[PDB]
Write an enzyme that holds these catalytic residues in place. Structure first.
Site, PDB file in Angstrom:
ATOM      1  N   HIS A 365       0.817  -1.339   0.078  1.00  0.00           N
ATOM      2  CA  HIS A 365       0.058   0.041  -0.101  1.00  0.00           C
ATOM      3  C   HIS A 365       0.785   1.031   0.245  1.00  0.00           C
ATOM      4  CE1 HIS A 365      -3.866  -1.966   0.767  1.00  0.00           C
ATOM      5  NE2 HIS A 365      -3.398  -2.941   1.346  1.00  0.00           N
ATOM      6  N   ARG A 557      -6.004  12.479   5.376  1.00  0.00           N
ATOM      7  CA  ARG A 557      -4.969  12.896   6.313  1.00  0.00           C
ATOM      8  C   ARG A 557      -3.914  13.861   6.048  1.00  0.00           C
ATOM      9  NH1 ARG A 557      -4.298   8.828  10.959  1.00  0.00           N
ATOM     10  NH2 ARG A 557      -2.696  10.400  11.698  1.00  0.00           N
ATOM     11  N   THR A 664      -8.458   6.696  -2.303  1.00  0.00           N
ATOM     12  CA  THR A 664      -9.682   6.198  -2.513  1.00  0.00           C
ATOM     13  C   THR A 664     -10.656   7.330  -2.504  1.00  0.00           C
ATOM     14  OG1 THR A 664      -9.532   5.416  -0.253  1.00  0.00           O
ATOM     15  CG2 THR A 664      -9.491   3.813  -2.024  1.00  0.00           C
TER      16      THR A 664
HETATM   17  O1  LIG Z   1      -4.207   5.004   3.076  1.00  0.00           O
HETATM   18  C1  LIG Z   1      -3.136   4.462   2.803  1.00  0.00           C
HETATM   19  N1  LIG Z   1      -2.308   4.508   4.058  1.00  0.00           N
HETATM   20  C2  LIG Z   1      -1.382   3.730   3.735  1.00  0.00           C
HETATM   21  S1  LIG Z   1       0.022   3.116   4.682  1.00  0.00           S
HETATM   22  N2  LIG Z   1      -1.427   3.241   2.401  1.00  0.00           N
HETATM   23  C3  LIG Z   1      -2.504   3.786   1.670  1.00  0.00           C
HETATM   24  O2  LIG Z   1      -3.462   2.647   1.342  1.00  0.00           O
HETATM   25  C4  LIG Z   1      -4.627   2.893   0.633  1.00  0.00           C
HETATM   26  C5  LIG Z   1      -5.383   1.582   0.284  1.00  0.00           C
HETATM   27  O3  LIG Z   1      -4.431   0.882  -0.533  1.00  0.00           O
HETATM   28  C6  LIG Z   1      -4.343   3.872  -0.669  1.00  0.00           C
HETATM   29  O4  LIG Z   1      -5.417   4.422  -1.400  1.00  0.00           O
HETATM   30  C7  LIG Z   1      -3.479   5.127  -0.277  1.00  0.00           C
HETATM   31  O5  LIG Z   1      -3.132   5.782  -1.548  1.00  0.00           O
HETATM   32  C8  LIG Z   1      -2.121   4.647   0.620  1.00  0.00           C
HETATM   33  O6  LIG Z   1      -1.630   5.901   1.084  1.00  0.00           O
HETATM   34  C1  LIG Z   2     -11.742   7.277   2.033  1.00  0.00           C
HETATM   35  C2  LIG Z   2     -11.205   8.131   3.312  1.00  0.00           C
HETATM   36  C3  LIG Z   2      -9.929   8.197   3.382  1.00  0.00           C
HETATM   37  C4  LIG Z   2      -8.873   8.175   2.520  1.00  0.00           C
HETATM   38  O1  LIG Z   2      -8.856   9.058   1.568  1.00  0.00           O
HETATM   39  P1  LIG Z   2      -7.619   9.491   0.581  1.00  0.00           P
HETATM   40  O2  LIG Z   2      -7.855  10.965   0.070  1.00  0.00           O
HETATM   41  O3  LIG Z   2      -7.222   8.540  -0.385  1.00  0.00           O
HETATM   42  O4  LIG Z   2      -6.316   9.642   1.485  1.00  0.00           O
HETATM   43  C5  LIG Z   2      -9.235   8.693   4.700  1.00  0.00           C
HETATM   44  N1  LIG Z   2     -10.031   9.110   5.649  1.00  0.00           N
HETATM   45  C6  LIG Z   2     -11.340   8.826   5.638  1.00  0.00           C
HETATM   46  C7  LIG Z   2     -12.508   9.451   6.687  1.00  0.00           C
HETATM   47  C8  LIG Z   2     -12.125   8.312   4.408  1.00  0.00           C
HETATM   48  O5  LIG Z   2     -13.322   8.197   4.301  1.00  0.00           O
END
Ligand SMILES: O=C1NC(=S)N[C@@]12O[C@H](CO)[C@@H](O)[C@H](O)[C@H]2O
Ligand SMILES: *Cc1c(COP(=O)(O)O)cnc(C)c1O
Ligand SMILES: O=C1NC(=S)N[C@@]12O[C@H](CO)[C@@H](O)[C@H](O)[C@H]2O
Ligand SMILES: *Cc1c(COP(=O)(O)O)cnc(C)c1O
Lengths: 830, 830
Positions: A365, A557, A664
Site C-alpha cells: 500500500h 490525513r 480512494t
Molecule cells: O491510506 C493509505 N495508508 C497507507 S499506509 N497506504 C494507503 O493505502 C490506501 C489503500 O490501498 C491507498 O489508497 C493510499 O494511497 C495509501 O496511502
Molecule cells: C476514504 C477516506 C480516507 C482516504 O482518503 P484519501 O484521500 O485516499 O487519502 C481517509 N479518511 C477517511 C475518513 C475516508 O473516508
C-alpha cells in the site's frame, strides 16, 4: 419517499412493537425518561434483530457446503456508523423511517447519535471496510480478522488553531452490533525460549495472553448474506497473572493484569509511517497468532474432520484457505504458519513451505521508505525467538534460490536479503511477504508498475508471475446510496436500481448528458447537498459560509506528500490577487481543508496551524467579503466524509506524482458529482483515463518529470527567484503576516519549503494555479460544469470495490463471486 | 413438585418461546451449537424479563408518592448467584422447571453455571445482601450503594495443602442482571488544594475520575417490589487524562487511563483487619462522593423541585433521606456532606451539622483493635485536603462539647479526640462516625453492651441516647426456601407458607415436637441433604465420605479469633483416642472445615496447611477406617454455603467470648436443622436464649472469665502441664508427626499457642472436648437428636433479617415497613 425500500403495512407495525419491546425490556426505560440516545439504541437493537436470523443461516450454510474460505487479515478496519448501512443492505430504510415517524421520532436525528467505529487511520483501514461489504455482496465465504481496540483513532480538537488529541472512547455507551464470544477464547504466547530436543524444536517458558473474539455481522447488499468480522481482545489469564508466587502483593498482581490487556487498548495513529515500538509488534503477533489457530480449527473440521483421505493432510489446506495480508502488518502469519505446521503438526519444511506460499498473498500500500516495516532483530529475538529462527531459515533458502538464478551477483544477494545489516540488524517485512506469498499486488496501475520497476525490481526479475495489480475501489452502497440518496434516486429514475451492485451500468447515464431535465436534476441535488452541509456547519460548528460559492475541498490525513501546503499556496495567492484588485470579479470559493495529523508528526501539526492561520486573516478581511472563505474541517472521519463529499464541487488530489499509491477519496468525490483537480498519481490516472482527460483537471509533473528533476537536483530557490507571486507569499509567511504575535512561528515551514522539500511543492505551483483558473472559468458556466460532472459520474463504475473484489477472487484467491440471493432469512430452529 | 409456585399452562408455554427468543436473538445461537452456558443465559434473560416491568413501576411509584429514602452505603455486597433467588421471589421456580424440562434441559444443571457475585469478604458483605432482600420484601424505598469491582474475593485453590489465590474474573462471560447507566456518570475529585476566598473555601486543582453507575434489580418476596442496587465503576475522563499537554507520549497517555480506573478494579480481601493503603482510601471516598451527589440530585427533585416552601431548604433533608453507614468504610460521607452543604450550597456550619447528624447513622461490626480504621493524617492531607480541614473543625467543636460536659477531665479529652497523636497522627474513623450520627448500634446484644461498657464508654456517657442494638439476621428466602426446599416443604405442609415472610410463625412447629410423622420427615430431609452433599463432594472434588457419620462443620473465614485451631485440637484428640483403643466404638464423624485466609495473613494460611496436614494422616490411617474423616472445604463462598449448611448436623461457633460481634453463619445452621456447639459469644447467646440452653451445646469461658484471666495473666504452659492429652498433641506437632518431610513446619503455630495466644485456645480445650462428648452421646439417639433439632428450627424465627430491618426502620430511619403487594407488574407504557 425514495427507493429506500417499501414501507409495508405489516412490517411498519411489526417494527414499532419491537422498538417498544427493546425500549422497555432491553433498555429498561419508559417513554417518560427515554432520551434520544435510548431511542437510538431501541432502534439499533430492532434493526440488529433482522440480521441475526440471516447471520446464523449464512454461517450454517458455509458449514454444509464447505467452500474455500477467504481470510482478510488487517490491523485496521475503519467501519464508521453501522445503523443506516444495515438498513440499506436489508431494504429496511423506509419502513424504519415510517415506523419511527409514527412513534413521533426523527430517524435522522437518531442516526447522528451513533458513534463511529474508528478502528483505522485512513485509506488502508477504510479499504478493508469497503472490501468486507463487497465480499458479502458477492457471496464470498470471507472473514475479516483484526483487533478490537477499545480506543480507536483519536478525536481531533482545534485549540487556538492547534490540534488537540483526545481519547476515542467509542465503547463508553456500549456496542449493540458486536457479540462477545468468550467461549472461543484462545491463548497467544510471547517471549520464552527455544529448546531443540530429539524430534523438533519447542517454544518454551512463554508468557500467555488470551485472545477473546468479538463478532460483528457484515451484511451483503440485499442478498441475505451476512458475513463475519472477528475482532480479538486481549485478556490476562487468571493463573500465572497471579499464580507466579513468592511475594509481590496480591493486589498488585491483580492490578498488573492491565499489562497483558494493554495489547488491544489503542490503535497506533500513524498513517504512512512506521514506528518500531514493542507494543505495535505485540499487536501484530497477537492478531496473527489468534487468527491462525481459528483458521486451522475450522479447517480440521471442514469435511476432513469427518473423512476425506483420512490423515490430517494439509495438502488440501490451500484449496480450502486463502489468507490476504493487508500490507506487512500481519506479515508474521508466514513464519507463524510454518511454526505450527513444522513444530506442532510435524510437516517436513518443504511441504510446509509449499502450503504456506500457496495460501498467502500480500498487498503493498505504499512506496515511501519511512512507511516500510523494518523490525530490529533484537526485538524479534526477545519477543518471538522461534519466529526469528524460522525467518533466518526462510532467508537462507531464498537467497540460495537467488544465487542459483543469478550466479555471482553478490550485490543482488544483499539487496534481496530479508535481513538488513548496518547500525542494527533489521528484518525487512516486505521482503518476507514477497518470499512467502504466491501473489503480490499494487493498488493502482501506476503504483503496481512502480513496484516492478523500482522497489521490488529484483524480486520481479526472480518471480515475475507473482506480481499483479488490483486497482482499489469504494462501495457504492455507503458511498452513494447511503450518503447521497438524492443523487441515487434521480439516477434510478432513469436507469433503474440494478446499478447499486453493478456500477458499470452508470455508463448508461452518458445518453442523458444532453438531457435538459437530468442536467437540472443533477445540479439540483448538488445544490441541496451544499445547503444541508452549509447548515450542518453552523449547527455543530458555528460561523457561516456561502452556499453559492464553489465548494473547494481537500479532505484526507495531513501529510507532506499529500501537499495540503500546495493548496495553501493557492489560497494565499487568491487572497493576494483580490487585495490587489478588490473591485474585480472572481468566482467565489469556500475552500475546506480537513484531516488529522499523527500526534508525533510535528510538520503536519504545523500545517494545520498554517491553515487556521490563513483562515484567521482571510475570513476577517472586509475587502474580501464572501468571495473567499478558508475553513478547516474538524475531526475528519468516515461519518464526516459522508457529509462533505456529496456537497463538494472541487475535489483536491494533489499529491506529488508517484507518492500516493492509489487514493480512494478521489473515487468517492467522482461518484458524488465533484470535478477533480489533480496530478497523474495513483488511481487519478485511471480515473482521467475512464472519464477522458478533457473532463478532468490534470496538472503538474508526471512521475518521469519528478525523476528528471531528481537527477538534475531539486533547487527551490530557482522557483522562488522566477515567480514574484510565490516570492511574495514566502515573504508574507517569513515576516509574520499570518502570525502577528509570533512572527517567526512558520519558520520551519519556510525553511523546509526552501531547503528540504522532499515533495517539490514549488515545482508544481505555476501549473497548479493556472489549472485552478481553468476550473473557475468552467464554474462560471453552470450548464457545462454539470455536463462534465455527468461525464465523471457516468464513468466511475470501474471504481466500485465489487470490481476489485471480483478480481482478487478470480486472479488471486481462486473463487467465483456470485450474486445469488441466499434462501431468505425465514425463521427456522433445528 | 413442591411449593415453588404454580406451573401454569399459559405461562410454561410463554416461558418456552421467550427462552427460544433469547437463545436465537440475544445469544445468536441455534440449538445445534448451544452449550449449557448458552442455555443458562437464555434462561437468565427470560427470567430477567419478568422483573423489568416491576422494576420500572416500583421506581416510578417512589417518584410519585415520594417517601423517605433509605441509602445503605457499604463497600461490600456479597450477593452470590441471582437466578434462583429471582425465580423464588417471583414465584417462577416451578414454571421455569417445567418449561426447561419440556425443552429437554435440567434447570439445576444450568443454575450451577452462574458465577457468584463475590463482592464481599464474608459476614459484613453477606449481611448487606440479606438486608437488601429484607428491605424490598418490607416495601422500603431503599437503595444499596457500593463499588462494582471487576475482581471480587479471590478464588481459593489448595496446592500441596496450601492456599493459592487466583483472580475472580466474574464478569468474563458478562452479567445479565446489571444495567449500565452511562448517562448518569458523575465526577469525583482527588488531591488538589484548598483556596480560602472572600465568601468561602474552594477545593481546587483536583484530579477528576468519573463514576459510572450500574443498576442491579433487588426483588422483594412475592410483593412485586423491585428495589435497586447501584454499583459505581471508575472511568477516566477523556480530556485531562490525555489533554494535560507538553510531551509524555500520546500512546502512554491513553495506556495510563488504567490508573484512574484501578480504583474499582479489586476488592481488598481483608476480613476483620485494617490495611491503610491509599488505594483503599480512594475506593472509600469514590463510593461516598458519587453516592452523595446522586442522593442530593434525587432530593432536589422530590416535591421541592416543583414547589413546597420554595427555596432549597435542606431542613427537610433528614425527613426525606436516611443514610446508613455499614461500618466506618463509608465514614467520609459525614465530612463530605458538610463540604457540599457548606462549601457548595452555602449553609451555615451549624445548620449543616444539624442536617448531617440527623440523616447519618453508624453501625459497628467489630471490637478487635486491628480491625479499626485509623487513617494517617498525611494521607488525608494529600488526597482529601478540604475534608481534613472539616474533620479538624468537627473535632474542635466536639471536644468543646466534651470539655463543657466534663470540666477538667483532660484525659477524657485526648481519649475522645477524632485525632490520635503519637508516631504518626491518625484520624479515628469510628470516633468520627459516632460524632456525626444520631444513632450508633451494635450487631448483637452482648456486642452492643460491650461497646457501651468498653470501646465507646466515654461516648456513651456523653450521649447515651445514640447507642442502640440491632441483632443481625439472615433472609429466610435464600437461607431456607432456596437452599433447603425439602425442609421448607414439610414445614409448609403443617403450618402453611406465611412463615417465609413471617419467620416467627415457625414457633407453631413446637407442637409437632412429639409428632411421629414430622420427626421422621425432618430426619429424612436432613438425610437426603447429606447424601446430595456427599455426592457433590465426589462429583466436583473427588475422594469419598460416609453419609451415615455425623457431619461436623465449621465454615467461615480463617481467623485466630474464630479458633479453627481449637477445632483442630479436638480432631487430633479424637484421632489419638482411636489409636489408643482401636476396637472401641465411637460415633463416626466427618468434620469439614472451610474458609478463606486473607493473602497477607501468614498465621491463617499456616492453619489451612495444618488442617490439610491432619487430614493427610487421619484419612489414610487404616485403623481409623470410616470413623473419622477430616476434609477441608475448598473455595468456601455463598454458593458453597447453600450446599453445606443444609447438610450439616453440628455447627461450630467457637470464637473466644467477646470477639465475634454477632456472626450469621450460626443463624443459617440453626434454621436448617443443625445443632450448635459454641461459646457464649455474639448472637450465640440470643440463640440459646431463644431455643433454651438445654437445646444448645454451650461451653467455655464467658466474657467475664476471659477478663478475669487477663487480670491474672494468661499462661498457656499451665494448661499444657495439667492436661496430658493436650501435651501429647503439642508434642506431636512439634516433632513432625503431622509433617514428616518438614518436621519444624508447624513451629510458628506451637510457638504462638504457647507464648502469644491472644485468644486463649488452651483455656477452653477441656470444656470443649467434654462438650463434644455430649453431642456424640445425643447423636447415638436419633429420635432425641431430631427432637432437639425441631426445638431449634421452631425457635429461629427471631433471626430473620426482616425482624432486624423492621427495627432499623422504626428505631433509626423513622419509616414504617409494609407487606403490601405493589399493584401487579401489568404491562403499561405511558
Ligand atoms: O491510506 C493509505 N495508508 C497507507 S499506509 N497506504 C494507503 O493505502 C490506501 C489503500 O490501498 C491507498 O489508497 C493510499 O494511497 C495509501 O496511502
Ligand atoms: C476514504 C477516506 C480516507 C482516504 O482518503 P484519501 O484521500 O485516499 O487519502 C481517509 N479518511 C477517511 C475518513 C475516508 O473516508
Ligand atoms: O463478618 C464480619 N466482618 C467484620 S469486619 N465484622 C463482621 O460483621 C458481621 C455482620 O455484622 C458479624 O456477624 C461478624 O461477627 C463480624 O465479624
Ligand atoms: C454467612 C456467611 C459468612 C459469615 O459466617 P460467620 O460464621 O458469621 O463468620 C461468611 N461467608 C459466607 C460465604 C457466608 O455465607
Amino acid at each position: 419517499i425514495s427507493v429506500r425500500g417499501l414501507a409495508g403495512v405489516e412490517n411498519v407495525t411489526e417494527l414499532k412493537k419491537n422498538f417498544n419491546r427493546h425500549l422497555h425490556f432491553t433498555l429498561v426505560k419508559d417513554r417518560n425518561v427515554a432520551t434520544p440516545r435510548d431511542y437510538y439504541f431501541a432502534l439499533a437493537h430492532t434493526v440488529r434483530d433482522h440480521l441475526v436470523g440471516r447471520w446464523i443461516r449464512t454461517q450454517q450454510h458455509y458449514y454444509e457446503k464447505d467452500p474455500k474460505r477467504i481470510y482478510y487479515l488487517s490491523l485496521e478496519f475503519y467501519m464508521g456508523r453501522t445503523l443506516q448501512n444495515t438498513m440499506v443492505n436489508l431494504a429496511l430504510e423506509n419502513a424504519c423511517d415510517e415506523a419511527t415517524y409514527q412513534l413521533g421520532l426523527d430517524m435522522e436525528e437518531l442516526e447522528e447519535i451513533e458513534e463511529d467505529a474508528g478502528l483505522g487511520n485512513g485509506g488502508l483501514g477504510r479499504l478493508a471496510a469497503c472490501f468486507l461489504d463487497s465480499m458479502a455482496t458477492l457471496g464470498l465465504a470471507a472473514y475479516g480478522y483484526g483487533i478490537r481496540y477499545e480506543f480507536g483513532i483519536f478525536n481531533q480538537k482545534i485549540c487556538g488553531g492547534w490540534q488537540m488529541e483526545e481519547a476515542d472512547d467509542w465503547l463508553r455507551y456500549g456496542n449493540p452490533w458486536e457479540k462477545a464470544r468468550p467461549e472461543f477464547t484462545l491463548p497467544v504466547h510471547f517471549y520464552g525460549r527455544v529448546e531443540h530436543t530429539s524430534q523438533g524444536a519447542k517454544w518454551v517458558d512463554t508468557q500467555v495472553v488470551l485472545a477473546m473474539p468479538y463478532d460483528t455481522p457484515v451484511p451483503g447488499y440485499r442478498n441475505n448474506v451476512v458475513n463475519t468480522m472477528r475482532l480479538w481482545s486481549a485478556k490476562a489469564p487468571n493463573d500465572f497473572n497471579l499464580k507466579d508466587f513468592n511475594v509481590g502483593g496480591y493486589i498488585q498482581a491483580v492490578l498488573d493484569r492491565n499489562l497483558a490487556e494493554n495489547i488491544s487498548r489503542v490503535l497506533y495513529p500513524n498513517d504512512n509511517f512506521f514506528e518500531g515500538k514493542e507494543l505495535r509488534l505485540k499487536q501484530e503477533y497477537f492478531v496473527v497468532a489468534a487468527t491462525l489457530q481459528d483458521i486451522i480449527r475450522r479447517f480440521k473440521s471442514s469435511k476432513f474432520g469427518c473423512r476425506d483421505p483420512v490423515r490430517t493432510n494439509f495438502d488440501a489446506f490451500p484449496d480450502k484457505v486463502a489468507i490476504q495480508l493487508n500490507d506487512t502488518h500481519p506479515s508474521l502469519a508466514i513464519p507463524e504458519l510454518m511454526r505450527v505446521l513444522v513444530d506442532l503438526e510435524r510437516l517436513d519444511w518443504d511441504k510446509a513451505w509449499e502450503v504456506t506460499v500457496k495460501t498467502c498473498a500480500y498487498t503493498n500500500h505504499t512506496v515511501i521508505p519511512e512507511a516500510l516495516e523494518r523490525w530490529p532483530v533484537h526485538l524479534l529475538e526477545t519477543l518471538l525467538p522461534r519466529h526469528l529462527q524460522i525467518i533466518y531459515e526462510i532467508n537462507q533458502r531464498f537467497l540460495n534460490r537467488v544465487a542459483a538464478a543469478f550466479p555471482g551477483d553478490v550485490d543482488r544477494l544483499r539487496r534481496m536479503s530479508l535481513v538488513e545489516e548496518g547500525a542494527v540488524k533489521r528484518i525487512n517485512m516486505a521482503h518476507l511477504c514477497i518470499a512467502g506469498s504466491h501473489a503480490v499486488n499494487g493498488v493502482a496501475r501506476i503504483h503496481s508498475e512502480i513496484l516492478k520497476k523500482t522497489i521490488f525490481k529484483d524480486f520481479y526479475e526472480l518471480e515475475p508471475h507473482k506480481f499483479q495489480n488490483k486497482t482499489n475501489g469504494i462501495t457504492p452502497r455507503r458511498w452513494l446510496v447511503l450518503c447521497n440518496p438524492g443523487l441515487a434516486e434521480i439516477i434510478a429514475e432513469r436507469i433503474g436500481e440494478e446499478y447499486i451492485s453493478d456500477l458499470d451500468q452508470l455508463r448508461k447515464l452518458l445518453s442523458y448528458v444532453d438531457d435538459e431535465a437530468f442536467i437540472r436534476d443533477v445540479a439540483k441535488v448538488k445544490q441541496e447537498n451544499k445547503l444541508k452541509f452549509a447548515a450542518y456547519l453552523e449547527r455543530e460548528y458555528k460561523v457561516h459560509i456561502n452556499p453559492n460559492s464553489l465548494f473547494d475541498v481537500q479532505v484526507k490525513r495531513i501529510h507532506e506528500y499529500k501537499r495540503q501546503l500546495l493548496n495553501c499556496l493557492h489560497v494565499i495567492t487568491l487572497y493576494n490577487r483580490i487585495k490587489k484588485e478588490p473591485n474585480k470579479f472572481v468566482v467565489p470559493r469556500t475552500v475546506m481543508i480537513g484531516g488529522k495529523a499523527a500526534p508525533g508528526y510535528h510538520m503536519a501539526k504545523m500545517i494545520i496551524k498554517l491553515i487556521t492561520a490563513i483562515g484567521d486573516v482571510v475570513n476577517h478581511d472586509p475587502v474580501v467579503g464572501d468571495r473567499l472563505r478558508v475553513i478547516f474541517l474538524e475531526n475528519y472521519r468516515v461519518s464526516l466524509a459522508e457529509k462533505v463529499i456529496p456537497a463538494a464541487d472541487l475535489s483536491e488530489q494533489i499529491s506529488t506524482a508517484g507518492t500516493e499509491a492509489s487514493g480512494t477519496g478521489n473515487m468517492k468525490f467522482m461518484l458524488n458529482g465533484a470535478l477533480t483537480i489533480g496530478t497523474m498519481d495513483g488511481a487519478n490516472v485511471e480515473m482521467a483515463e475512464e472519464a477522458g482527460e478533457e473532463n478532468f483537471f490534470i496538472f503538474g509533473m508526471r512521475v518521469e518529470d519528478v525523476d528528471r528533476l531528481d537527477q538534475r537536483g531539486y533547487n527551490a530557490q530557482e522557483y522562488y527567484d522566477r515567480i514574484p507571486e510565490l516570492r511574495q507569499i514566502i515573504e508574507q509567511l517569513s515576516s509574520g503576516f499570518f502570525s502577528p504575535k509570533q512572527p517567526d512561528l512558520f519558520k520551519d515551514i519556510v525553511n523546509m519549503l526552501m531547503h528540504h522539500d522532499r515533495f517539490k511543492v514549488f515545482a508544481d505551483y505555476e501549473e497548479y494555479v493556472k489549472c485552478q483558473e481553468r476550473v473557475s472559468a468552467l464554474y462560471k458556466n453552470p450548464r457545462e460544469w454539470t455536463r462534465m460532472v455527468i461525464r465523471n459520474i457516468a464513468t466511475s463504475g470501474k471504481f466500485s470495490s465489487d470490481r476489485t473484489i471480483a478480481q482478487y477472487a478470480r486472479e488471486i484467491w481462486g473463487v467465483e463471486p456470485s450474486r445469488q440471493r441466499l434462501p431468505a432469512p425465514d425463521e427456522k430452529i433445528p
